[PDB]
């Protein structure tokens, strides 16, 4: 059973299992680079077990856990965080403790390097952070506990940004999000494109992963 099919077949059950779990705690990493430090990554740097680099092919600074915590194969689920462009450094500082946390469910993420930007309004005026999520089990299926941890993490990011006074940016038309998410948005890259549209958004709202994160 594919990752997506497994979620679809067990939706209500997973949904009910998640509802009984306790608050997820994320120990915040203190010795972490600030936005400027991230840009200093170059060809290689390490921090809190995350390999860092910003050497060149794209407009982002990359972060990947050396010892991954999710053993399944990537199934396309990813999030974006949109804030005012000039607030990216502040937003990064507000979220670094969580992004580098030894308890974070995100093994891989990226943030736009504002100095490398050309005319990519999509990831500069919005969607400046990208979070990759992958099934935790070796069999590539999501466990209810991991889904809960992931939803709790995303809600933690939302709380942290609001608590720091960050203002939302331009949400990518390729993504979908409930009214209560002011900065976060979602899309599955295996079943959607970076080019938004009402058709795509209506299709994304039925993704079982998205439904488990919002309903």
Swiss-Prot record:
Q: Explain what the UniProt record notes about the effect of disrupting the gene for this protein.
A: Strains lacking this gene are attenuated for systemic virulence in mice.
Protein name, per record: MAPK phosphothreonine lyase
Q: Consequence of mutating residue 189 to A?
A: Nearly no decrease in enzymatic activity
State what this protein does. Answer: Secreted effector that irreversibly inactivates host MAP kinases by catalyzing the dephosphorylation of the phosphothreonine residue in the pT-X-pY motif in MAPK2/ERK2, MAPK3/ERK1, and p38, via a beta-elimination reaction leading to a dehydrobutyrine residue. Is also able to remove the phosphate group from phospho-JNK in vitro, but JNK may not be a substrate in vivo. Could help suppress localized pro-inflammatory responses at infection foci in the spleen and liver, and thereby facilitate bacterial growth.
Q: Which residues form the active site?
A: 80 (proton donor), 110 (proton acceptor)
Gene encoding it? spvC
Changing residue 108 to R has the effect of: No effect on enzymatic activity
What family does the entry list?
Belongs to the phosphothreonine lyase family.
One annotated GO molecular function:
lyase activity
